[PDB]
Amino acid sequence: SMTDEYQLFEELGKGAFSVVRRCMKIPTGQEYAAKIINTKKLSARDHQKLEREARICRLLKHPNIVRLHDSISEEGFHYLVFDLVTGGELFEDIVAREYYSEADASHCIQQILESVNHCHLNGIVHRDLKPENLLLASKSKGAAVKLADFGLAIEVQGDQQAWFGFAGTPGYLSPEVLRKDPYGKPVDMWACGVILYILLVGYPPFWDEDQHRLYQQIKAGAYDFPSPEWDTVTPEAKDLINKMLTINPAKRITASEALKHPWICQRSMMHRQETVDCLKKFNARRKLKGAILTTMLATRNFSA
Amino acid sequence: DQLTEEQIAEFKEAFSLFDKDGDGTITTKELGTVMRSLGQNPTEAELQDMINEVDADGNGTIDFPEFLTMMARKMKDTDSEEEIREAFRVFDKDGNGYISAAELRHVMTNLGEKLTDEEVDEMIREADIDGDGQVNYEEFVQMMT
Ligand SMILES: CN(C)S(=O)(=O)c1ccc2c(c1)/C(=C/c1cc3c([nH]1)CCCC3)C(=O)N2
Ligand SMILES: [Ca+2]
Ligand SMILES: [Ca+2]
Ligand SMILES: [Ca+2]
Ligand SMILES: [Ca+2]
Numbered sequence: 435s436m437t438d439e440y441q442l443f444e445e446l447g448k449g450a451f452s453v454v455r456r457c458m459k460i461p462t463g464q465e466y467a468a469k470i471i472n473t474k475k476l477s478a479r480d481h482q483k484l485e486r487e488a489r490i491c492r493l494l495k496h497p498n499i500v501r502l503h504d505s506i507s508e509e510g511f512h513y514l515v516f517d518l519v520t521g522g523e524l525f526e527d528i529v530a531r532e533y534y535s536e537a538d539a540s541h542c543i544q545q546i547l548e549s550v551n552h553c554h555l556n557g558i559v560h561r562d563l564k565p566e567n568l569l570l571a572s573k574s575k576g577a578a579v580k581l582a583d584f585g586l587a588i589e590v591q592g593d594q595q596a597w598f599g600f601a602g603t604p605g606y607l608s609p610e611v612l613r614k615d616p617y618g619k620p621v622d623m624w625a626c627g628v629i630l631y632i633l634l635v636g637y638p639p640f641w642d643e644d645q646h647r648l649y650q651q652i653k654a655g656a657y658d659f660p661s662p663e664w665d666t667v668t669p670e671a672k673d674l675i676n677k678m679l680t681i682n683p684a685k686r687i688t689a690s691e692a693l694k695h696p697w698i699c700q701r702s703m704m705h706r707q708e709t710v711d712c713l714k715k716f717n718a719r720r721k722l723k724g725a726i727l728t729t730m731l732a733t734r735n736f737s738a
Numbered sequence: 739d740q741l742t743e744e745q746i747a748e749f750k751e752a753f754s755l756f757d758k759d760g761d762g763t764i765t766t767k768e769l770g771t772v773m774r775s776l777g778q779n780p781t782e783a784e785l786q787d788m789i790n791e792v793d794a795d796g797n798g799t800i801d802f803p804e805f806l807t808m809m810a811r812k813m814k815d816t817d818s819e820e821e822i823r824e825a826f827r828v829f830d831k832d833g834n835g836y837i838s839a840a841e842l843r844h845v846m847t848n849l850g851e852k853l854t855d856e857e858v859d860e861m862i863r864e865a866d867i868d869g870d871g872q873v874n875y876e877e878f879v880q881m882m883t
Contacts, residue, residue, distance in 0.1 A: 718857065718861045718863070719861075721857070722865060722881070723882070724750075725752075728755045729825040730825045731809070732776045734821065735780045736778055737820055
């Protein structure tokens with residue numbers, strides 16, 4: 435059973451009908467995060483969602499996706515054993531730093547795009563891309579960003595699209611979801627555009643306290659790059675954002691295409707040389723006369 | 739202006755020997771370094787007076803135009819004879835009447851110059867008319883006139 439395989443330690447966090455505790459695989463000593471779900475509290479509907487989420491997480495193995503290592507069902511408790519991460523949410527790192535440099539933003543979004551591309555290649559649409567759902571694997575300046583919170587993820591068949599429901603996070607919702615149109619993989623690329631915008635300047639492209647107005651702005655694509663903060667941001671960054679925040683989902687950049695954008699992947703002169711025929715001749719006579727003249731001048735005080 | 743281009747070049751060479759840091763001016767300390775390097779022993783007041791006498795614009799240092807105009811002084815012929823003779827005695831450290839390659843090398847080292855032994859020999863040969871390997875008084879005079 436779970437307690438024969440895993441030693442549980444302190445609580446790290448809480449969730450809906452759940453706690454996360456640090457744990458350790460008994461025979462190996464390797465540490466993880468165990469999400470402990472009290473299934474006596476779950477309706478059949480919610481357990482069905484847990485079933486889908488675990489199935490989807492099991493399928494996904496990638497350095498930029500939080501890995502599910504084990505799913506153990508017991509009486510009244512379900513255990514999901516994930517990677518331990520110590521770097522917190524990308525959201526909080528953005529708040530702490532205000533915003534990222536272009537170098538750091540490009541590097542961050544590159545990893546996010548790899549996570550999204552992997553999902554999409556596997557017939558999974560996450561539907562809830564946002565900095566709160568992206569975790570930093572450790573406290574290293576070089577830590578990997580890892581996609582988490584697959585509670586809204588869906589399984590799709592190729593590029594077939596449908597009305598999969600109104601689900602996601604308001605500021606990150608795509609125009610097609612807001613219009614109640616059929617949708618698919620491109621909703622994650624819209625959300626990516628919102629995150630890139632936030633990375634670069636520390637505030638979102640669409641925001642209003644009145645959610646109806648927020649939704650109107652999103653559907654209109656009513657964002658811009660205002661001065662002065664955007665003045666020093668390169669046009670290449672703004673261009674990639676533009677291609678993600680494209681209202682028509684058929685024209686919106688895909689994750690694979692975005693990974694080839696010059697701002698992401700092209701971040702890192704010869705002149706003729708003339709022949710030297712010889713060196714310049716030492717001028718012996720000028721050297722000697724200069725020295726003699728110097729000495730003549732130097733001897734004036736002794737004479738006068 | 740009434741000097742030849744080669745005469746100007748010779749004085750620029752002399753100027754570079756005083757202007758140790760190459761900033762285009764000669765300070766009092768620079769003047770003293772040269773003087774003492776050539777076995778001359780002026781007081782600090784004497785050095786400052788030398789600077790003051792040559793410093794036309796009164797900014798405290800000597801630039802190349804000031805340095806030129808000074809030795810554009812067509813002084814007495816007896817004064818130029820004296821300068822040449824005393825200069826000879828500076829090079830001829832052992833007082834035997836001949837400037838050897840070793841003696842010239844020592845003067846150039848004292849002045850802070852870094853020349854090869856071949857360059858020094860070449861310099862001796864420019865003055866050494868009779869080809870004995872040394873510069874005598876008559877040869878030294880001929881060179882400077
Ligand atoms: C993504 N959700 C927050 S979760 O509950 O499914 C989840 C999934 C994987 C996880 C953690 C949390 C998780 C939580 C966590 C919180 C804290 C830590 N890990 C490290 C020490 C301070 C607080 C962790 O390390 N790996
Ligand atoms: Ca100087
Ligand atoms: Ca001056
Ligand atoms: Ca001698
Ligand atoms: Ca001779």
